[PDB]
Design a protein around this nucleic acid. Structure first.
Length: 1198
RNA sequence: GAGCCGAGGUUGUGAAUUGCUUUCAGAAAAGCAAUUCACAAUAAGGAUUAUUCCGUUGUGAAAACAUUCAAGGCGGGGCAACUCGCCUU
DNA sequence: CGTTTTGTCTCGGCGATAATCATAGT
DNA sequence: ACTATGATTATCTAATCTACAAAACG
């Protein structure tokens, strides 16, 4: 008689909501409220989530964190090297004196940038190793190239020299730190692949293409021939790009069973493919029979202009660097007696690991080579453990009491699917579920071949010894054949058959020289634990060797068989090991079944059920189903449900009765909600704000009372996954406890479909109200474009109709330009009653009389439905007209940071490693402080710099986009002159002049374009810009880094006021906000230098009201009489810069036509947002703007 | 969702070579650079000495948190710290 | 001032299937 | 001798703008 319905139009970043209360029997009803809540998301995410490309803020934050973590790990390696070398007395005096060895161990002292080789004496820098540089000079002159080379090329000369000769200890420290910089490519798993692993990179020329007579797709395929005698494996069709073309290949070879090389082919081109580049560099290094450092040194000797870093050696295997460093260290150990000193080694080991005695005792047996190479520099951490994220068992729970005097439950981790207990349980399940059917008549031929316990025991034994069962093997075990019988499932599908024991038996038979009885249950599970738990190469090898030593087995072929065992797939079952251990005695039948192996609880329950007594834990359905279990002997080969109830006492997942009687339950559920509980963060964010909106509606319109929402309709109109989880969550509100409403989702949740929505919109005229609601925008567009092509006349409706020209018909749709369409969708979903959706989903009647009553009740005499009440369209249109869209504001600028770090804490006279919280106050910046690109400050005497601005320059690649205007912005004038000369030579055509071949030609003959004077090659140039860029920081060289504010970081636009009436405008930078908020002050300075008082500041996604020109709003207040014209004048802050504050009307979501530089037209001009009102008055908003406050429901918070 | 790593790029310091402009006076210096090398920083900053980290996630007024969390015993694993399991509150 | 035009850090591995080559039972 | 099944690599795994901040221009 009176019923409350709420509708939610969930979107990708929007939440449209509505609430209706209708009396259907009297054709009465009304809309309590409507609105649209918007979470600010850019169109990039909305266009990327459909395909998927790193669509997550958390993903970008994680990428930044990973880069940082690599940086601090490199820095920590450098600090440890500094400490060790200072103990060894290897650092130079000037470099060591600027390193802190007492408070911040190994770190540079503040405001210092020392260099290991550049000694700063009384203002002049001198190279530390003059003798080595001189030796390199005679080396170069013997190569006959030049005598003027950089000092810092000595690193490679020393790297080559250190292989076989003595070098100075400071040079050795330089080498060690340089090795710490560049480490190489390495795969942590290792697991050396096939012994051949050819993967050779070659260059071959095609000789002949002989037709092979294979016609496919109306063309006879051909093959390829090479000079060495190799045939390209695949067929070739296009002969134009294959005749005598020198393609490069990564050819792979492998020795097969027959004993010949199966040579594949992989067409690849260098300098664009990582694999080809790496393989070519590695082959060049290896065929020279020299280390990477020696190869680099000789290459640089041959071509002094060669780019080393990033051109010559980009990415090579870490083994090359490790071999070079090992050779250097073993050679230098023979000369430097510090590296052979045990006392110095003990001092180093104590300094590094003073509180870790075990690691000290471990490293006491090694030497400095292992410390520098294996321990410090090339130490790579293993993958972080993820066993804490494993899903928990749903049945077996452990309860305990903590120190807080409470009692919570500790969950049990799920058993791995490959655990032999899980394998046995799954095999028993598959045997129980297995039955046979005949091909002839499709009759239940089973129960004759599998009737007694002997048959099932034989089948279990047969399946135990195999790894995968199929049609033919299972048929042959029963002597049946494919031509006469089938096994009730997919004929060409195979099932797991306890493969683990199969491989275990195979590898325990491969070792031989043992009896065929060593494989038992305990030994099998021990080998399982050894292989699975110990996931590390050397650890696994040592574990296997020690296991073979403990048990009387030969450790010769057992280790060899088990050393290359394939890793297990990461998977876990639904239950835990305890659950399967308890269920298996029930599963087992025959000789594997015994009553003594069933635990006390299940045995007692079985005794009770067979006795027939009355117990509270036994349901009537149990006696209905377990009636056949009269004797305890019948409890053999029971199914999963039976055994589950016997062990526990629950008929499968029985769910709970989650009913919430007040908004406080919803509030605490919000408090207890967990992050990353769904598919992606987008949906969890949307639902978080969704139920928050639901809580706000509940509080506002029902005071949080019980059973306020009689029904909730959720429809959306990829995104299907969020059509049911939300229904389940909100079933806690719309559930009925009388027993007639049962299930995971309450019957009060009725999601719909698009057909009903469209039909009711057309019949009730929601399309009409939307059209004449959006028409004024199109009339304005016609007036702006002084044409009549944005509105189409029709005579039946005697009015205009919004439309777009075909040339602007790319992706325009009328239902996506205004944010109120979310509210419209929510309203149409909410009002779709059960009768309406039933009628429009089951229109197929099979008889006109059966559905004629619904025709009489709902539609007017299939033409038109009755409106829900007399004025449904009218008041629906009014409610759309009086909606203030609520926009979420993200004003998080700083936040409190919590850091927990492991540490040795002195406890009870002993040092034990534990976790400690960081002391003091540490702030976290929640916004991107600046853009990635970094520019330097320069001053140009030929550029007039106005006061308040600076010149910043950065390096750019020289390309075809360098015209006269672009050339004029280069900081240097020599390059400007040269480029102007070259461009004049090429008839003023940047495309021809600055093409890569054109750039190469310019660099070849740069003398002719420089008035005959030599110049270095030009590939990149520095271009300046006259603007306002701020410094990154204040310490070290961070002062010299000038950056630009990141996207969406101008959060504040302050308008300052004098006593006269004049307004002044200024946008607050982010760093000032940081300082003011961390000092506890207000975000915006309430005072300028001139002394003007602050009126207010504007922030993005904030709503302001612009009064009419005649109105004078100073202390009007009265924010209840917001009729249509008032909301029509509400504007939203979009972006700000300098003295400009751009606005878009709050209703507007997407533009009718975005501005394009070609047509030079747009709805809101070039910026797609105006500093003035859209109407004809065209008045500056900031001159008379007054701020309004909106809650989540869009009400005015006066 | 997260973890283990890698290669460049950018700004700055230092250096070798070569340019444009200016001031001294073809010498010297400065501003702006180009090719190559070493190094520093790589979001401002804050702890720590563990082979540990927190800083572009989200919540909300507490400038508080979630994103980490017990006790014991019965075990596997290594040179072992540590890690992987079982058992009861 | 009002308005439009231009620039913005980028690349690798730790992947999936599809297709041909073998390869024993039949 | 024919068939179906077990396995290595080749091929692909997409195809990307958006919109703010501000210098440049009229």
């Amino acid at each position: 008689m009176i019923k409350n319905i709420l509708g939610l139009a969930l979107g990708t970043n929007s939440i449209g909501w509505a609430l209706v209360k209708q009396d259907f029997e009297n054709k009465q009803g009304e809309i309590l409220g409507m609105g649209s809540r918007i979470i600010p998301m850019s169109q990039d995410i909305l266009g990327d989530f459909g395909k998927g490309n790193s669509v997550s803020q958390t993903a970008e934050r994680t990428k930044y964190r990973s880069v940082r973590r690599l940086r601090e790990r490199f820095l920590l390696r450098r600090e440890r090297l500094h400490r060790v070398l200072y103990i060894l007395n290897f650092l130079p005096e000037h470099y060591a004196s600027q390193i802190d060895f007492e408070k911040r161990l190994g770190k540079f002292k503040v405001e210092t940038e020392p260099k290991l080789v550049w000694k700063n004496t009384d203002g002049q820098f001198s190279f530390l190793f003059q003798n080595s540089f001189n030796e390199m000079l005679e080396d170069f002159k013997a190569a006959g190239q030049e005598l003027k080379i950089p000092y810092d090329w000595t690193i490679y000369h020393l790297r080559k020299k250190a292989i076989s000769q003595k070098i100075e200890k400071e040079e050795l420290a330089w080498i060690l730190l340089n090795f710490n910089h560049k480490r190489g490519y390495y795969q942590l798993r290792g697991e050396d692949f096939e012994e051949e692993k050819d993967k050779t990179f070659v260059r071959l020329k095609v000789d002949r293409i002989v037709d092979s007579g294979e016609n496919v797709k109306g063309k006879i395929l051909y093959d390829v021939y090479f000079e060495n005698g190799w045939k390209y494996d695949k067929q070739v069709v296009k002969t134009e790009d294959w005749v005598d073309r020198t393609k490069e290949f990564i050819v792979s070879e492998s020795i097969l069973k027959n004993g010949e090389t199966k040579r594949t082919f992989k067409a690849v081109d260098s300098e664009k493919d990582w694999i080809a580049i790496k393989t070519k560099t590695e082959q060049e290094i290896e065929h020279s029979h020299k280390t990477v450092g020696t190869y680099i040194y000789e290459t640089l000797l041959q071509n002094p202009k060669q780019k080393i870093k990033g051109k010559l050696v980009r990415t090579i295997e870490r083994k090359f660097y490790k071999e070079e460093l090992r050779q250097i260290l073993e050679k230098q150990k023979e000369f430097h007696q510090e590296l052979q000193s045990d006392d110095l080694y003990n001092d180093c080991i104590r300094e590094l690991y003073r509180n870790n005695e075990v690691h000290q005792l471990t490293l006491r047996k090694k030497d400095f080579v292992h410390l520098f190479m294996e321990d410090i520099i090339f130490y790579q951490r293993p993958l972080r453990s993820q066993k804490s994220s494993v899903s928990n068992c749903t049945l077996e729970f452990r309860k305990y009491k903590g120190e807080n005097g409470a009692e919570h439950t500790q969950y049990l981790k799920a058993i791995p699917k490959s655990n032999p207990y899980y394998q046995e349980f799954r095999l028993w399940q598959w045997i129980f579920n297995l039955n046979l059917y005949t091909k002839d008549n499709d009759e239940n031929v089973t129960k004759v071949f599998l009737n007694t316990t002997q048959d099932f025991e034989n089948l279990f034994e047969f399946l135990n010894t195999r790894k995968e069962v199929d049609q033919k093997a299972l048929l042959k075990h029963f002597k049946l054949n494919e031509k006469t019988h089938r096994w009730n499932f997919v004929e060409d599908k195979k099932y797991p058959c306890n493969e683990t024991k199969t491989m275990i038996s195979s590898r325990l038979d491969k070792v031989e020289n043992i009896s065929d009885d060593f494989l038992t249950r305990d030994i099998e599970q021990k080998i399982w634990h050894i292989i699975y738990s110990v996931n590390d190469k050397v650890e696994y090898e040592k574990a296997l060797k020690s296991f073979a030593r403990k048990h009387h087995l030969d450790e010769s072929s057992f280790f060899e068989a088990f050393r290359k065992f394939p890793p297990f797939k990461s998977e876990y079952g639904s239950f835990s090991e305890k659950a399967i251990k308890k269920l298996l005695p029930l599963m087992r039948l025959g000789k594997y079944w015994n009553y003594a192996e069933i635990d006390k609880y299940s045995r007692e329950r079985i005794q009770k059920i067979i006795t027939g007594e009355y117990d509270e834990n036994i349901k009537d359905k149990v006696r209905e189903k377990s009636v056949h279990l009269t004797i305890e002997n019948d409890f053999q080969g029971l199914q999963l449900w039976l055994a589950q109830y016997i062990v526990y006492g629950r008929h499968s997942e029985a769910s709970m009765i989650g009913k919430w009687n007040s908004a406080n339950d919803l509030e605490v559920f919000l408090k207890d909600f967990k992050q990353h509980s769904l598919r992606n963060p987008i949906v969890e964010q949307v639902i978080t704000e969704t139920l928050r909106v639901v809580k706000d509606i509940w509080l506002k319109y029902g005071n949080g009372t019980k059973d306020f929402f009689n029904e909730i309709h959720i429809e959306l109109g990829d995104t299907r996954y969020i059509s049911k989880y939300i229904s389940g969550i909100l079933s806690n509100i719309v559930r009925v406890e009388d027993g007639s409403d049962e299930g995971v989702n309450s019957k009060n949740i009725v999601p719909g479909n698009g057909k009903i929505t469209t039909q009711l919109k057309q019949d009730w005229g929601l399309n009409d109200v939307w059209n004449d609601l959006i028409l004024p925008r199109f009339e304005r567009m016609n007036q702006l474009t002084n044409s009549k092509d944005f509105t189409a006349w029709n005579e039946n409706h005697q009015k205009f109709l919004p439309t777009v020209p075909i040339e602007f018909s790319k992706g325009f749709s009328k239902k996506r330009i205004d944010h109120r369409h979310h509210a419209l969708d929510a309203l149409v979903i909410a009002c779709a009653t059960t009768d309406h959706v039933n009628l429009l989903n089951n229109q197929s009647a099979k008889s006109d009389t059966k559905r004629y009553d619904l025709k009489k009740k709902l539609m007017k005499f299939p033409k038109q439905f009755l409106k829900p009440w007399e004025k449904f369209t009218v008041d629906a249109k009014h409610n759309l007209e009086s909606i203030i869209v609520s926009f979420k504001q993200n004003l998080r600028v700083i936040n409190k940071a919590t850091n927990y770090y492991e540490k040795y804490v002195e406890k009870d006279g002993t040092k034990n490693k534990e976790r400690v919280e960081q002391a003091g106050t540490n702030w976290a910046i929640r916004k991107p402080m600046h853009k990635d690109t970094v520019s330097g400050k320069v001053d140009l005497p030929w550029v007039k710099v106005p006061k308040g601005k600076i010149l910043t320059a950065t390096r750019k690649s020289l390309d075809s986009s360098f015209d006269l205007k672009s050339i004029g912005s280069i900081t240097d004038t020599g390059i400007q002159k040269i480029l102007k000369n070259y461009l004049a030579f090429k008839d003023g055509n940047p495309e021809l002049a600055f093409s890569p071949e054109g750039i190469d030609d310019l660099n070849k003959n740069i003398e002719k374009y420089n008035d005959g004077k030599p110049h270095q090659p030009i590939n990149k140039v520095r271009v300046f810009e006259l603007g306002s860029k701020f410094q990154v920081g204040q310490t070290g060289n961070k002062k010299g880094k000038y950056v630009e504010a990141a996207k969406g970081t101008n959060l504040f636009f302050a308008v300052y006021e004098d006593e006269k009436g004049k307004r002044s405008y200024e946008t607050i930078p982010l760093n000032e906000v940081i300082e003011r908020q961390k000092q506890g002050l207000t975000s915006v300075p309430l005072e300028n230098e001139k002394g003007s008082r602050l009126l207010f500041d504007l922030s993005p996604n904030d709503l302001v009201y612009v009064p009419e020109i005649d109105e004078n709003i100073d202390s009007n207040f009265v924010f209840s009489n917001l009729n249509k014209e008032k909301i029509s004048r509400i504007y939203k802050v979009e972006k700000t810069s300098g003295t400009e504050c751009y606005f878009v009307r709050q209703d507007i979501a997407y533009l009718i036509k975005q501005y394009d530089a070609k047509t030079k037209i747009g709805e809101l001009e070039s910026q797609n947002k105006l500093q003035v009102t859209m109407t004809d008055d065209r008045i500056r908003i900031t001159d008379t703007c007054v701020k309004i406050n909106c809650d989540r429901l869009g009400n005015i918070n006066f």
